[PDB]
Amino acid sequence: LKCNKLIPLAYKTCPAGKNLCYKMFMVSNKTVPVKRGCIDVCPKNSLLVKYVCCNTDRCN
Numbered sequence: 001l002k003c004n005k006l007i008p009l010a011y012k013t014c015p016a017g018k019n020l021c022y023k024m025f026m027v028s029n030k031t032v033p034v035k036r037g038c039i040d041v042c043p044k045n046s047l048l049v050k051y052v053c054c055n056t057d058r059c060n
Contacts, residue, residue, distance in 0.1 A: 002057040003038045011058055014038035020053040021060030036060050 001014035003021035014021075017040055024035040029050050037060075042053035054060060 001038065001055070004036050004058050004060045006033070006036050008036065008058070008060070012038070020055055021058070022051050022053045023060050025050040025052075 001019055001021065002011045003014055004011050015038065018038040020039045020042060022035075022037060022039045022042065023029075023033040025031050026034050027048055027050070029052060039051075039053065043049075043051050045051065052060075
Protein backbone atom coordinates (compact mmCIF):
# COMPACT_ATOMS: atom_id res chain seq x y z
CA LEU A 1 0.00 0.00 0.00
CA LYS A 2 1.30 3.27 -1.34
CA CYS A 3 -0.83 6.14 0.04
CA ASN A 4 -0.76 9.79 -1.18
CA LYS A 5 0.44 12.44 1.35
CA LEU A 6 -1.11 16.02 1.56
CA ILE A 7 0.40 16.98 -1.86
CA PRO A 8 -0.58 13.83 -3.83
CA LEU A 9 2.52 14.35 -6.03
CA ALA A 10 4.22 12.50 -3.12
CA TYR A 11 3.41 9.16 -1.49
CA LYS A 12 4.76 6.86 1.17
CA THR A 13 4.59 3.10 1.48
CA CYS A 14 2.26 2.17 4.44
CA PRO A 15 3.83 0.39 7.42
CA ALA A 16 2.74 -3.18 8.24
CA GLY A 17 -0.70 -3.25 9.91
CA LYS A 18 -2.14 -0.22 8.04
CA ASN A 19 -3.96 -1.29 4.84
CA LEU A 20 -6.07 1.92 4.19
CA CYS A 21 -5.33 5.24 2.44
CA TYR A 22 -7.25 8.08 4.11
CA LYS A 23 -8.15 11.73 3.36
CA MET A 24 -9.04 13.85 6.41
CA PHE A 25 -11.39 16.91 5.98
CA MET A 26 -12.46 19.76 8.40
CA VAL A 27 -16.34 20.11 8.72
CA SER A 28 -17.03 18.82 5.18
CA ASN A 29 -15.76 16.28 2.56
CA LYS A 30 -17.04 18.82 -0.04
CA THR A 31 -13.97 20.86 1.06
CA VAL A 32 -10.21 20.19 0.64
CA PRO A 33 -8.23 17.71 2.68
CA VAL A 34 -6.06 18.82 5.50
CA LYS A 35 -4.19 15.45 5.91
CA ARG A 36 -3.52 12.35 3.75
CA GLY A 37 -1.94 9.08 4.79
CA CYS A 38 -2.10 5.45 5.98
CA ILE A 39 -4.44 4.00 8.57
CA ASP A 40 -5.57 0.52 9.88
CA VAL A 41 -9.32 1.41 10.36
CA CYS A 42 -11.42 4.31 8.96
CA PRO A 43 -12.25 6.50 11.95
CA LYS A 44 -15.95 7.35 12.55
CA ASN A 45 -16.99 10.83 11.17
CA SER A 46 -17.00 13.42 14.07
CA LEU A 47 -18.99 16.74 13.98
CA LEU A 48 -15.87 18.77 12.92
CA VAL A 49 -13.73 15.98 11.32
CA LYS A 50 -14.37 13.63 8.43
CA TYR A 51 -12.49 10.84 6.72
CA VAL A 52 -12.80 8.90 3.46
CA CYS A 53 -10.67 5.72 3.18
CA CYS A 54 -9.91 3.39 0.32
CA ASN A 55 -7.61 0.40 0.03
CA THR A 56 -5.71 0.80 -3.31
CA ASP A 57 -2.27 2.20 -4.16
CA ARG A 58 -2.70 6.06 -4.26
CA CYS A 59 -6.49 5.76 -4.25
CA ASN A 60 -6.41 8.71 -1.75
